[PDB]
Amino acid sequence: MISLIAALAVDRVIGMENAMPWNLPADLAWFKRNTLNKPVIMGRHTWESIGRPLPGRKNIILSSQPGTDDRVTWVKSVDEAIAACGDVPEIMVIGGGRVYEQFLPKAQKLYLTHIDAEVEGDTHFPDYEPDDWESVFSEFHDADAQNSHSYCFEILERR
Ligand SMILES: NC(=O)c1ccc[n+]([C@@H]2O[C@H](COP(=O)([O-])OP(=O)(O)OC[C@H]3O[C@@H](n4cnc5c(N)ncnc54)[C@H](OP(=O)(O)O)[C@@H]3O)[C@@H](O)[C@H]2O)c1
Ligand SMILES: Nc1nc(=O)c2nc(CNc3ccc(C(=O)N[C@@H](CCC(=O)O)C(=O)O)cc3)cnc2[nH]1
Ligand SMILES: [Mn+2]
């Protein structure tokens, strides 16, 4: 099973200048809980944005060019990325925009955080078709001293 996880600001913005400009510790905690002990697939730009391997997860990087770091696994196509995960129950695709576009048709589940923040961005989460997806979990949180925007955790499953 393939799942996508992402945090979206208004208008599906997910990044700007190879960064995420907001800071929502509660959402990073949600990301860690839902990805720990699973393989994570990311594109090369997202690997450079994170800047280090994510501990406790098999890190698989898509790039058309040879890898430059043997602490992670480098693959050259979507099919190779999936194969490198082996026989696991759930593969987590962690972006960025180009990678999400390619894995969306193959995904059964989306873990989305909707952030009430207006962000100029240059990268968006794919338009998906709402009729294809059932919301099975949602949890709203107001802003607090640690998290400066309200946010909504949602899990959707392909109907
Ligand atoms: N809010 C969130 O949840 C979230 C999550 C992840 C990322 N982001 C943001 O998203 C942005 C980066 O996204 P992006 O769309 O620019 O880049 P990306 O999807 O992270 O990476 C694209 C790169 O991955 C490689 N790639 C993708 N598909 C491939 C394929 N089928 N075969 C081989 N290589 C493939 C290519 O690398 P080569 O050029 O080396 O071939 C391509 O240039 C940043 O702003 C980051 O902060 C946000
Ligand atoms: N909901 C969501 N939020 C994100 O921030 C996110 N980020 C990415 C890609 N970028 C990043 C950037 C930093 C870390 C990171 O530092 N993660 C630590 C945080 C642990 C914690 O804060 O409790 C980790 O071990 O996962 C992960 C992914 C992909 N999907 C996402 N999905
Ligand atoms: Mn092929």
Ligand SMILES: [Mn+2]
């Ligand atoms: Mn197999």
Ligand SMILES: [Mn+2]
């Ligand atoms: Mn806000």
